[PDB]
Design an enzyme around this catalytic site. Structure first.
Site, PDB file in Angstrom:
ATOM      1  N   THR A  78       0.803  -1.136   0.243  1.00 37.46           N
ATOM      2  CA  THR A  78       0.042  -0.036  -0.212  1.00 37.46           C
ATOM      3  C   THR A  78       1.164   1.300   0.119  1.00 37.46           C
ATOM      4  O   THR A  78       2.117   1.319   0.592  1.00 37.46           O
ATOM      5  CB  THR A  78      -0.898  -0.035   1.238  1.00 37.46           C
ATOM      6  OG1 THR A  78      -2.073  -1.048   0.887  1.00 37.46           O
ATOM      7  CG2 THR A  78      -1.666   1.146   1.342  1.00 37.46           C
ATOM      8  N   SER A  79       0.476   2.340  -0.830  1.00 38.54           N
ATOM      9  CA  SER A  79       0.873   3.605  -0.521  1.00 38.54           C
ATOM     10  C   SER A  79      -0.331   4.624  -0.635  1.00 38.54           C
ATOM     11  O   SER A  79      -1.022   4.741  -1.485  1.00 38.54           O
ATOM     12  CB  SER A  79       1.776   3.829  -1.998  1.00 38.54           C
ATOM     13  OG  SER A  79       2.957   3.131  -2.084  1.00 38.54           O
ATOM     14  N   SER A  91       3.614   0.373   2.987  1.00 38.55           N
ATOM     15  CA  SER A  91       5.016  -0.267   2.306  1.00 38.55           C
ATOM     16  C   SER A  91       5.718   0.644   1.295  1.00 38.55           C
ATOM     17  O   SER A  91       7.045   0.730   1.360  1.00 38.55           O
ATOM     18  CB  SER A  91       4.400  -1.407   1.823  1.00 38.55           C
ATOM     19  OG  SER A  91       3.630  -1.570   0.833  1.00 38.55           O
ATOM     20  N   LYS A 147      -9.089   2.596  -1.290  1.00 38.17           N
ATOM     21  CA  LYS A 147      -8.538   2.650   0.220  1.00 38.17           C
ATOM     22  C   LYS A 147      -9.028   3.956   1.047  1.00 38.17           C
ATOM     23  O   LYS A 147      -8.560   4.246   2.100  1.00 38.17           O
ATOM     24  CB  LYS A 147      -6.883   2.450   0.043  1.00 38.17           C
ATOM     25  CG  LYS A 147      -6.749   1.300  -0.353  1.00 38.17           C
ATOM     26  CD  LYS A 147      -5.219   1.121  -0.422  1.00 38.17           C
ATOM     27  CE  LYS A 147      -4.494  -0.107  -1.309  1.00 38.17           C
ATOM     28  NZ  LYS A 147      -3.206  -0.089  -1.375  1.00 38.17           N
TER      29      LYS A 147
END
Lengths: 244, 248, 192, 239, 196, 231, 193, 220, 239
Positions: free
Chosen positions: E1-2, E129, E33
């Protein structure tokens, strides 16, 4: 209604809770408390009766702070007022814990109203024998409330409770007529002193000590503070000269 | 709650006064009736409006308890509503969740009667001020009609009426009921019996009628399971009631 | 579970069901008894239970309790489908801290006369216990639909015997029930 | 029997009847009407004490985004009901993933009232609750709940001491119009209708301070400020 | 995920990738998200999807209650509710939340709630991450009071690099723009941002 | 159970008229120097500063507890600004109680705390508590990595209580600042940016924010070549 | 470990239990009676964890005595063994299981039949002609399987028990200090050699 | 197990294989994995079958009760929310992995739920041991404008990819089709691609091959 | 508080009587007569139905007589709902006993437990007693056929023949007159029906007004279907 008044939470045939009306009679026997909403704050004042020379002056404090920004003052059964303020302090702490902002004054008012109204729901509890004047400064400015034994509350421009309530209420009416632009905090302190002195033209059976508090964005940075020293003496002087 | 004691108690004559007073509340209620046919059950009631502005369509006096069990009441409407909610839940939790099957009518009636009995003996409660007529079908017992009273006593009936008109209605039903009665005849007799006890205006808006009958696969809402029966409970529309009343 | 050993098989036939089990009670390799019947009945519904013998006994006693109360309330004996649902819900009530068992339901519905088995309603055959995979092999080879009760008896008996002969922990005799709506015959088989 | 919610020999619950009497303590009348895609609530505001802050005096509550409630009866019980209804609506949205319908909330609050009619230790609340929304399925909706735990939907309703005069005038209007709703496309004209009708029924003109007005639309329930009520009153004076 | 949130002159922009992974398998390539907890209060979720969804639902519930009782919550209040949940359940819940919101007085605010449930008010936040790979880029390229367009570009570039380098990040770039004007949702596809 | 974001060393020192306490402004996230504006010195009134190291979320919880304690102390107490103000010793005993209770519930606040202050009688207060509830006082206190490097330097100034009256605020502040510089040289989780607070029995609390480590020496690094044989 | 053995013959149940008690390195006692009389015609022997066995057996004894006083009647050995099985089956699911294996020998005076029930700590109950727990069966069951006859007299049963004990003494590596032997029959419970 | 969901222009399809396995053993060749939550809300479970059955039964019961209470058709978001919160409470110890599909007054919906309580929305989904093969088919053939017949073809092709390529999947394809404004169309054994060939001989034994010790009638 | 409304069940009168028990007994004196007779070879239970109408399903109404297990039945006089509560408890207790001991519950153990439940409500908890008297018919291998009664006090007693409900003084008089220890079940059936016929306050005893059961030798436990009641009424010459 001599049949229906022996037990809280009973409706009378005309729909009344007589135990709440009797708690109101307990309030009306109390000393005079007032509140004044000023252009950026609130002023609280209370008549403290000097029942004897032996009471320590300035020491039997009747106004209570809640959190740092709410003042509470009440007339009637003083211990019931302390009990209500203890609940208020719990409610304010809980609100600030979950929501880190200080509790808004209308929110606090509803928390108290619900707690007082709950003491009208059951025969296993007594109504509060106090009427409470409370208020403060929040993000939306100043708010002044008066809460009745029923749990009824409203916002007020000025409020009075206790034995001198009618004369205080008439003087607050005149004060609100004459200063439609809104009173200043220092002038509201002087007026509160005058009004308490005039209410003590009733109930003159004993001497009294004036206690004043205030919460003002300019004068206290929106924190509740007791009026002490020079400004209190000035207010007393103003009240005495306005009579004499 | 400090009311841990019973509010219903025996009098010296052995009456349970609160139960007799609840039955008086029921007997003042709007008339409801039930008729069992060979091939179904009718339950019917007057819908008395509280106002011409009220939407009586929004108030259900006849309730589905299970796809094959319906109830109607006379007496205190709110008590009935709360009993319906409890009956539905207990039909699930006490039976459907165990046996994969909806309860037979008699066992659900027992569960309702239990709920009603507990209000006559447990602490701090009054009895329910309602009498229920519960109509249902189940595979082994067939069609059933039961009355449950505030005491939680229940009785199976061939036909009965409850509420203000129940004496005249029961006499008419004793005249009209027979072992060969078909569901359309039972509906006709039900409409006649209500006509004699309604406060004048008599139509599909002032009447609520439901049947326990044939399975209705169109109401099931899905296809492809031949063993899944459609609901046998069906509330009649106001237009169906009017159509029948015009031919009455 | 395997501490005690044991196997149950059920099969449907033409208007009949068979249910059969081994009789061994073990304690790991030690054989304790050959009188430990694994098949119970509750009216006309038969339940085979394999697995831990304490749980077999406990569950039999519990289902006796529940089906007696059912008959008293309903005023009728429980049917196989309803009993299968009851078994399922009663075992899942211990979803955490399970009973270590494999139930097999067999019977004939009193009203429809349809033969029923479950372990679902996998209608051909149902297999449970230590020799389950031998039993699956045997039944999947030997089974034919619509066997008459005598041929069903032969088929289920040969499946059980030959599967048991390849399981160390089950045997020392077998019992077969042949169930018809009017009649249940119990038969004991010798094992060799 | 007079003091707790047990049956009288007549099968009555006197405390419930007396709780109905409490609903008129405030001497306030309220009116609700349905448009095509709005619901409007009008309530009288009586603020005789010049020391009151009138903005704090309200018997209309925003329960959720979509549900308004107006209460007839003393404000402490009204605020009790309002808080409970707010909690119920938020909890419903959390449990079930969609906004609580007005009729479902009215059912839930009526069931709580029934509990107070049946358990001796809790008194009834002395309030009548009128819930208003535009329901996603039912459209504009008025459901009114009372101390007996009765509730029903309404085409329109009024509550208070003069509810018969307002109700009979509404009934005559529907007899005049042969419709179940006010045939107007936008809520401002439904507000103007409701105010005009309250005036005709009560026989009194209103200042902008003498009223409070709630409007349910599809998007939200909202309460009019005193100056929006002024705009509606001058519209009535000019229309 | 960013995930990102960036304050700017008119408000705040939240950005996310759309990749959900289970090991190396992409279980959902089009994940959203960016979760609304209030009309102009949104969060970016990173970490356990179950924990962060449960928390966001509970926060939305608590803020709906707050709204009906006390009026509109501040972004700080939402961040406080998130904090209380993340902190009191820090042993069970693996939730790194970014909370972003707009109000007319405070304008755009960003709060990050890392693992452990500390709260940090920041002019911008990066998490997940893939944020590791863009710390240097964001520090070199963020500036206060960017325009909307500059901020969208800054997020697009940063997340494009985070997607380039992190296998657990990818798919579309989603953005939510919170301002006085309203709430605006943006989407950028790989054939847009992979050219950067 | 496990600390996530962490503050690092707090260092402190008595001097003749007061106490000095300093902590850097960094929240590290393992080796990531993630958060750089974390204030870790919490003033409580005008007479006390609480320096916190360890888990920042538990630090924020303690800061909330301390604000609540000030609010509660003001209730029904017209002398809360006077002889019934909170003392450093009251704040310490409360914190130590909380820490030890939390430890005994196996749910520690993962912190080391130094309470620095001046008592109303003018006595210096300087006491440590950690996540175990272990408490001790000394003329110098340091947490974490500062215990190993700063304490030797500060003890070269104040080795025993009879050195306290000899030690001026200038000397103590210089020693604290040099120790912060040494920590920046040698603690991989330190920041050059720090806060410093002085609590003087005469001049009160002075709280210095956004100090920076200065006058570092690095030029000798030019001469270092390889690791042994590289010329 | 402990030895408990049981043989149901035609007229009686014989229970045999080892006398040793061992703690760690030492034989503390050579005379321990590992049985409790549950009722005038029902005897239970027990083996297993130290403390658990006697606590369990005395709890059972108290409950059966309470039943007998309440009803003025003696439970069948069947009912007793069902009760004991239920208590053991509960204990498996409890927070600390009784690690106790029992033999229940009784004489049913309604049936005029001896009955021997073996119950393991799991609550596995089985009625048996002869029974054992632990390793005692590993050495004894082949003798019993070879020689046991249902119509054996008590004296033949005792001789077969003697053979089983001799085999244990030969092949089992522990010294169990012999057995106490109890007989349950129509006359009640007696101790024998 | 292979389960798929596929949204189409006016509805949603869910489909499953019918093989149930006990380890490497096929316990049931024709297990019905598509479970009705409500008439137009259907679910399918991977993971341990009993947990899927039980959570489906509980949620269906509460959904039916809630529909009766509200007098409204149940919503797929309610089934989702209740499943999510139940599974989160049990912290993934309920090993249910679900696709939930249905139609309600707000339209068509398709969700997956993981045992930990995480949910996602999708236009196409797959779960179970065959999920990768099914998703490969879905990724190569799904399109936004699918008709009903295209969506049924696509879903059954994805299940067939699971059946042929995953050992844990096999036997038949079951389909349920939920169009907006229509009854749910459950299609039990929509495909039967795995019919066993006839054996080389009959194995019916002659009567009496089995030795019987004794017989008795049982009273029932 | 609530003390005002507490009727104080579970107190002694000055005579040392429990008034709620005496009043529940009065309630039972208005319930339909039930009779038990212990023959040599079995037990008869017979009961009168008080509720009657042509529209009642007498063929499915089973309000007086209940099976507790395969070996024990009860006849009920009094509040049928309270009886159903107690009967369910007794059924559960019998199955618990079978689960524990793997033997059928002795009749006295069941009767004692249900009587102890009834006693509890007379001594603690402030609730009203159960308004039911039971006759228990059972068989067990200890005492064989046993007939018990129990009442709201939780007293129980064994009987050769017993009546409960309305006409019990007359019924017990007639039973004393005609009972014999040697008598068979078919004799006791006649004695039961003749006693009900001579004690009923209706105009004539008829199969719709009756419930009937027998326990006789294993033991079989028969609730008579109404046609069997017709057969037995004609066989006895009463119809």
């Amino acid at each position: 209604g001599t049949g229906y008044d022996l037990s809280n939470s009973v409706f009378s045939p005309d729909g009344r809770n007589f135990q709440v009306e009797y708690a109101v009679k307990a309030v009306e026997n109390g000393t005079t408390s007032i509140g004044i909403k000023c252009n950026d704050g609130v002023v609280f004042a209370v008549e403290k009766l000097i029942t004897s020379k032996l009471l320590v002056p300035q020491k039997n404090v009747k106004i209570q702070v809640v959190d740092r920004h709410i003042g509470c003052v009440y007339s009637g059964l003083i211990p019931d007022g302390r009990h209500l303020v203890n609940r208020g302090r719990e409610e304010a702490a809980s609100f600030k814990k979950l929501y880190k902002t200080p509790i808004p004054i209308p929110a606090f008012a509803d928390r108290l109203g619900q707690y007082v109204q709950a003491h009208t729901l059951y025969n296993s509890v007594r109504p509060f024998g106090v009427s409470t004047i409370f208020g403060g400064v929040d993000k939306n400015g100043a708010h002044l409330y008066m809460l009745e034994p029923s749990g009824s509350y409203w916002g007020y421009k000025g409020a009075a409770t206790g034995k001198g309530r009618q004369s205080a209420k008439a003087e607050l009416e005149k004060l609100v007529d004459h200063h439609p632009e809104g009173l200043s905090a220092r002038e509201a302190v002087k007026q509160a002193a005058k009004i308490i002195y005039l209410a003590h033209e009733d109930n003159k059976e004993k001497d009294f000590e004036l206690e004043i508090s205030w919460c003002s964005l300019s004068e206290t940075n929106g924190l509740h503070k007791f009026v002490k020293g020079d400004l209190l003496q000035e207010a007393i002087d103003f009240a005495q000269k306005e009579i004499n | 709650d400090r009311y841990s004691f019973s509010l219903t108690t025996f009098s010296p004559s052995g009456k349970l006064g609160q139960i007799d007073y609840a039955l008086t509340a029921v007997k003042q209620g709007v008339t409801s009736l039930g008729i069992k046919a060979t091939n179904g059950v009718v339950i019917a009631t007057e819908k008395k409006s509280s106002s011409p502005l009220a939407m009586s369509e929004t108030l259900s006096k006849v309730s589905l308890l299970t796809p094959d069990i319906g109830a109607v009441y006379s007496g205190m409407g709110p008590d009935y509503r709360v009993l319906v909610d409890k009956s539905r839940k207990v039909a699930h939790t006490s039976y459907k969740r165990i046996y994969g099957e909806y309860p037979p009518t008699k066992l659900l009636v027992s569960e309702v009667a239990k709920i009603m009995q507990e209000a006559t003996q447990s602490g701090g409660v009054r009895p329910f001020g309602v009498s229920l007529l519960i109509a249902g079908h189940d595979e082994f017992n067939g069609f059933s009609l039961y009355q449950v009273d505030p005491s939680g006593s229940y009785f199976p009936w061939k036909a009965t009426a409850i509420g203000k008109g129940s004496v005249a209605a029961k006499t008419f039903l004793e005249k009209r009921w027979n072992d060969e009665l078909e569901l359309e005849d039972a509906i006709h007799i039900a409409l006649l019996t209500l006509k004699e006890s309604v406060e004048g205006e008599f139509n599909g808006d002032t009447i609520e009628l439901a049947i326990i009958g044939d399975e209705n696969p169109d109401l099931l809402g899905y296809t492809g399971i031949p063993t899944d029966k459609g609901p046998r409970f069906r509330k009649l529309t106001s237009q169906e009631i009017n159509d029948r009343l015009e031919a009455l | 579970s395997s501490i005690n050993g044991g196997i149950v098989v059920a099969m449907t036939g033409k208007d009949c069901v068979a249910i059969a089990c081994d009789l061994r009670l073990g304690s790991q390799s030690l054989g304790v008894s050959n009188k430990f019947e694994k098949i119970f009945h509750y009216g006309h519904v038969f339940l085979g239970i394999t697995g831990l013998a304490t749980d077999v006994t406990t569950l039999n006693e519990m289902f006796r309790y529940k089906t007696n109360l059912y008959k008293l309330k309903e005023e009728r004996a429980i049917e196989p489908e309803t009993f299968t649902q009851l078994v399922s819900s009663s075992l899942y009530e211990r979803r955490f801290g399970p009973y270590f068992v494999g139930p097999v339901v067999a019977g004939i519905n009193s009203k429809s006369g349809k033969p029923f088995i479950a372990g679902d309603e996998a209608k051909d055959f149902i297999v449970s216990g230590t020799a389950s995979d031998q039993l699956f092999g045997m039944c999947e080879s030997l089974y034919e639909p619509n066997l008459e009760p005598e041929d069903l008896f032969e088929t289920i008996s040969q499946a059980l015997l030959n599967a048991a002969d390849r399981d160390a922990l089950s045997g020392w005799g077998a019992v077969v029930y042949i169930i018809k709506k009017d009649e249940v015959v119990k038969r004991y088989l010798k094992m060799r | 029997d007079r003091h707790i919610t047990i049956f009288s020999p007549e099968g009555r619950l006197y405390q419930v009847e007396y709780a109905f009497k409490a609903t008129n303590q405030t001497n306030i009348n309220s009116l609700a009407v349905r448009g095509k895609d709005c619901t409007v609530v009008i309530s009288q505001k009586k603020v005789p004490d010049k020391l009151l802050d009138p903005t704090t005096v309200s018997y209309i509550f925003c329960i959720s985004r979509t549900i308004g409630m107006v209460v007839n009866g003393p404000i402490p019980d009204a605020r009790n009901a309002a808080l409970r209804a707010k909690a119920e609506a938020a909890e419903f949205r959390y449990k079930y993933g969609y906004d609580m319908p007005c009729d479902v909330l009215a059912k839930r609050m009526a069931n709580l009232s029934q509990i107070y009619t049946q358990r001796a230790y809790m008194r009834p609340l002395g309030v009548i609750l009128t819930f208003v929304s535009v329901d996603e399925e039912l459209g504009p909706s008025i459901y009114k709940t009372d101390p007996a735990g009765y509730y029903v939907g309404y085409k329109a309703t009024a509550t208070g001491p003069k509810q018969q005069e307002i109700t009979t005038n509404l009934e005559n209007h529907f007899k005049k119009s042969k419709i179940d709703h006010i045939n107007e496309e936008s809520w401002e004209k439904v507000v103007e209708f409701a105010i005009t009708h309250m005036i005709d029924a009560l026989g009194t003109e209103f200042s902008k301070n003498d009223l409070e007005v709630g409007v349910a639309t599809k998007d939200k329930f909202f309460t009019l400020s005193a100056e929006n009520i002024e705009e509606r009153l001058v519209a009535i004076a000019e229309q | 995920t960013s995930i990102m949130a960036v304050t700017f002159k008119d408000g705040v922009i939240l950005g996310a990738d759309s990749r959900t992974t289970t090991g190396a398998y992409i279980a959902n390539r089009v994940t959203d998200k960016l979760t609304r907890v209030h009309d102009k209060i949104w969060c970016c979720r990173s970490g356990s999807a179950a924990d962060t969804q449960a928390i966001a639902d509970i926060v939305q519930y608590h803020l709906e209650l707050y709204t009906s009782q006390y009026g509109t919550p501040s972004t700080e209040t939402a961040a406080s509710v998130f904090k209380e949940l993340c902190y009191e359940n820090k042993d069970n819940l693996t939730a790194g939340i970014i909370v972003a919101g707009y109000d007319d007085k405070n304008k755009g605010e960003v709060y990050t709630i890392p693992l452990g449930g500390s709260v940090h008010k920041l002019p911008y936040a990066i998490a997940g991450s893939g944020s590791t790979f863009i710390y240097g880029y964001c520090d070199k390229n963020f500036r206060e009071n960017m325009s909307k367009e500059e901020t969208v570009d800054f997020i697009k570039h940063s997340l494009s690099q985070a997607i380039k380098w992190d296998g657990s990040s990818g798919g579309v770039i989603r953005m939510v723009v919170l301002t006085a004007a309203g709430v605006e949702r943006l989407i950028f596809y790989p054939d847009e941002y992979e050219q950067l | 159970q496990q600390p996530i974001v962490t503050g690092t060393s707090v260092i402190s020192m008595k001097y003749d008229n007061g106490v000095i306490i300093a902590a850097d402004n960094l929240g590290s996230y393992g080796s990531l120097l993630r958060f750089n504006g974390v204030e870790r010195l919490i003033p409580v009134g005008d007479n006390t500063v609480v320096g916190i190291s360890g888990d920042i979320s538990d630090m924020q919880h303690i800061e909330r507890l301390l604000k609540d304690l000030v609010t509660e102390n003001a209730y029904d107490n017209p002398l809360a600004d006077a002889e019934e103000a909170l003392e450093p010793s009251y704040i310490f005993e409360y914190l130590a109680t909380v820490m030890y209770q939390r430890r005994s519930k196996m749910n520690p606040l993962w912190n080391a705390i130094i309470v620095a202050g001046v008592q109303s009688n003018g006595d210096q207060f300087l006491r440590y508590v950690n996540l175990l509830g272990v408490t001790y006082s000394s003329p110098t206190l340091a947490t974490g990595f500062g215990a190993h490097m700063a304490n030797p330097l500060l003890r070269k100034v104040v080795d025993r209580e009879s050195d306290i009256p000899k030690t001026t605020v200038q000397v103590a502040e210089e020693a604290i600042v040099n120790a912060m510089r040494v920590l920046y040289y040698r603690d991989a989780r330190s920041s050059r940016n720090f806060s410093l607070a002085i609590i003087d029995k005469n001049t009160g609390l002075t709280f210095k924010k956004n100090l920076q480590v200065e006058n570092m020496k690095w030029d000798f690094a030019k001469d270092i070549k390889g690791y042994g044989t590289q010329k | 470990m402990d030895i408990i053995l049981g043989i149901r013959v035609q007229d009686s149940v014989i229970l045999a239990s080892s006398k040793a008690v061992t703690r760690g390195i030492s034989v503390l006692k050579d005379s321990d009676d590992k049985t409790r009389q549950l009722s005038p015609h029902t005897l239970m022997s027990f083996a297993g964890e130290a403390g658990d066995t006697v606590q369990f057996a005395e709890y059972i004894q108290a409950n059966i005595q309470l039943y007998s006083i309440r009803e003025d009647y003696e439970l069948s050995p069947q009912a007793v063994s069902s009760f004991v099985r239920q208590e053991l089956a509960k204990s498996i699911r409890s927070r600390r299981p009784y690690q106790v294996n029992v033999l229940i020998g009784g004489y049913d005076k309604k049936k005029n039949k001896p009955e021997l029930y073996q119950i393991d700590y799991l609550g596995t109950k089985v009625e048996l002609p002869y029974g054992a727990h632990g390793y005692s069966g590993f050495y004894t069951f082949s003798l019993l399987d070879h020689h046991y006859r249902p119509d054996m007299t008590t004296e033949e049963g005792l001789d077969l028990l003697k053979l089983c004990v001799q085999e244990l003494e030969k092949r089992m590596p522990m010294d169990f200090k012999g057995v106490i032997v109890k007989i349950v029959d129509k006359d009640g419970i007696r101790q024998v050699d | 197990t292979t389960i798929v969901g596929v949204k189409f222009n006016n509805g949603v399809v869910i489909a499953a294989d019918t093989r149930s396995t006990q380890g490497p053993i096929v316990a049931d060749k024709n297990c019905a994995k598509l479970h009705r939550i409500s008439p137009k809300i259907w679910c399918a479970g991977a993971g341990t079958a009993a947990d899927t059955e039980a959570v489906t039964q509980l949620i269906g019961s509460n959904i039916e009760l809630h529909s009766l209470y509200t007098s409204r058709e149940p919503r797929v978001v309610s089934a989702l929310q209740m499943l999510k919160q139940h599974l989160f409470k049990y912290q993934g110890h309920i090993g249910a992995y679900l696709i939930v599909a249905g139609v309600d007054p707000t339209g068509s919906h398709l969700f997956s739920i993981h045992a930990h309580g995480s949910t996602d929305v999708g236009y196409y989904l797959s779960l179970g041991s065959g999920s990768l093969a099914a998703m490969a088919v879905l990724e190569s053939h799904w399109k936004q404008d699918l008709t009903k017949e295209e969506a049924i073809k696509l879903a059954s092709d994805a299940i067939q990819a699971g059946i042929w390529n995953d050992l844990g999947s096999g036997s038949n394809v079951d389909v349920c089709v939920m169009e907006i404004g229509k009854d749910a169309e459950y299609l039990r054994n929509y495909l039967t691609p795995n019919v066993r060939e006839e054996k080389q001989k009959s194995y019916k034994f002659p009567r009496g091959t089995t030795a019987v010790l004794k017989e008795s009638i049982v009273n029932i | 508080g609530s003390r005002r409304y507490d009727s104080r069940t579970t107190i002694f009168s000055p005579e040392g009587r429990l008034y709620q028990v005496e009043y529940a007994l009065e309630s039972i004196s208005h319930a339909g007569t039930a009779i038990g007779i212990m023959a040599s070879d079995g037990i008869v239970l017979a009961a009168e139905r008080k509720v009657t109408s042509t529209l009642l399903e007498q063929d499915t109404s089973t309000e007086k007589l209940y099976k507790l297990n395969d070996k024990i039945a009860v006849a009920v006089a009094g509040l049928t709902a309270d009886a159903e509560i107690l009967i369910n408890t007794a059924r559960i207790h019998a199955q618990n006993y079978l689960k524990t001991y793997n033997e059928d519950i002795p009749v006295e153990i069941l009767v004692r437990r249900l009587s102890d439940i009834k006693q509890g409500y007379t001594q603690h908890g402030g609730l009203r007693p159960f308004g039911v008297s039971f006759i228990y018919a059972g068989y067990d291998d200890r005492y064989g056929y046993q007939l018990y009664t129990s009442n709201p006090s939780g007293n129980y007693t064994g009987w050769k023949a017993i009546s409960v409900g309305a006409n019990t003084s007359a019924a017990q008089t007639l039973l004393q007159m005609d009972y014999k220890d040697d008598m068979k079940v078919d004799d006791a059936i006649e004695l039961a029906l003749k006693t009900l016929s001579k004690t009923t306050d209706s105009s004539a005893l008829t199969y719709d007004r009756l419930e009937f059961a027998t326990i006789r030798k294993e033991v079989y436990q028969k609730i008579f279907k109404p046609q069997e009641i017709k057969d037995i009424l004609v066989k006895t010459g009463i119809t």
